[PDB]
Symmetry: C2
């Protein structure tokens, strides 16, 4: 069983015309895990896997562009249930330090909020997930996701920190946010530029780098060239439908 990541949405903040914000489909065997659930994510996701075949959701943080589709997903589960597309409760994992956001993850018997613990690995079917707190204006967690043979790291949202490097060590794929260009500083917004994403990939010895949480200006391909001045492996710009597999 190979591990397969499909980018569902990849824009920062809000979606470009016909595109989506943060959502990533992680699949192994029959298991389907959705990582983040932003704007237009469900619409796109259902082109790949129907609501009832989704096994779990995990959320890095509670910014609109990572959670806007949660309530629609809750409605999908409720209707699925009244349609007899199987009555199974959908677990949604998040941090519980923000009480009100976490409470909203639970909807009748249809979805169920489950607190992940930052200092302890989570098992979600065939996946193990470990966490790193990021530098972002709200509590937020990057994720090291493995199936035992391959490892994919998702930075979620963050400004640069050296701790990404031991955390991303030997990842087959690093999905790094890259909201800014080489000549810009994303510190005040809690974001990274392409040189920073390139630095993490190189220093961790990542096999491959995918740049995501994309900006709404500039030439995105410039983000690729800029990262490539630092990191020598494969680099790509995320888009809806982009697939990685190992």
């Amino acid at each position: 069983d190979p591990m397969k990541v499909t980018v569902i949405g990849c824009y920062g903040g809000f979606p470009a015309a016909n595109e989506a914000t943060s959502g990533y489909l992680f699949q192994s065997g029959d298991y389907s895990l959705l990582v983040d659930c932003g704007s237009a994510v469900l619409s796109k996701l259902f082109g790949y896997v129907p609501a009832e075949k989704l096994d779990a959701v995990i959320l890095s943080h509670y910014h609109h562009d990572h959670i806007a589709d949660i309530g629609p997903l809750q409605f999908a589960k409720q209707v699925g249930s009244f349609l007899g597309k199987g009555e199974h409760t959908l677990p949604i994992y998040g941090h519980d330090a923000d009480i009100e956001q976490f409470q909203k993850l639970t909807y009748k018997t249809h979805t169920k909020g489950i607190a992940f613990q930052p200092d302890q690995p989570l098992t979600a079917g065939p996946f193990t997930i470990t966490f790193l707190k990021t530098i972002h204006p709200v509590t937020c967690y990057a994720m090291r996701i493995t199936d035992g043979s391959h490892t994919v790291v998702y930075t979620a949202d963050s400004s640069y920190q050296d701790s990404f490097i031991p955390f991303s060590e030997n990842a087959d794929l690093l999905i790094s946010e890259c909201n800014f260009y080489a000549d810009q500083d994303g510190t005040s917004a809690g974001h990274m530029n392409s040189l920073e994403a390139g630095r993490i990939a190189k220093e961790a010895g990542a096999g491959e780098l995918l740049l995501t949480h994309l900006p709404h200006f500039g030439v995105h391909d410039n983000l690729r060239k800029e990262a490539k001045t630092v990191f020598s492996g494969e680099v790509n710009i995320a888009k809806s439908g982009f697939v990685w597999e190992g």
Copy 2:
């Protein structure tokens, strides 16, 4: 300047694959009004009009499938500000009887919540909008929207009530939720079926009928056919991209 309605999203509850939930673009001359702002609505919207050219938003009620994209919208306004695209604050109209939901409409200087009053007509640019409380499990309002020449009525979400008829009287286009088929009762969930949508069009003497808030089962074309056994004017199933003018 013709009045133009473009369906942005039209599924009930949650989007079908590559589609969207309640959203409708209302245009008149230079002005663009977004009626409801559900799931994948922004993504589709920006295909017709960019965030800075949006003049106002109005929300029928606070169910996920009508408001999910509000937060992303507020972020689009914010980033627009930083890019020099629009310093202009986007008004979002809604009822304020649900206090916490209403408070979420205002975001810094980027969007501004403005309370519409059910019993008083609202003037939004070239449009005048009047309201009818509907029968739904949360507070919700249908909308008669006119530019002085043409009138479009939007039922929003509701089970059947007679008051829709005088409310929809002589509408040029009636946009009616139609979450159920002829042989089903939508009362318990606050929704209507195809015969009820048809009944309103017929008795209000609506010029044309558009069925929306669509279900995720059955053959949608049957909604059209069933409605056509009561109403004799034109009847269509909503889809993203459908244009009435």
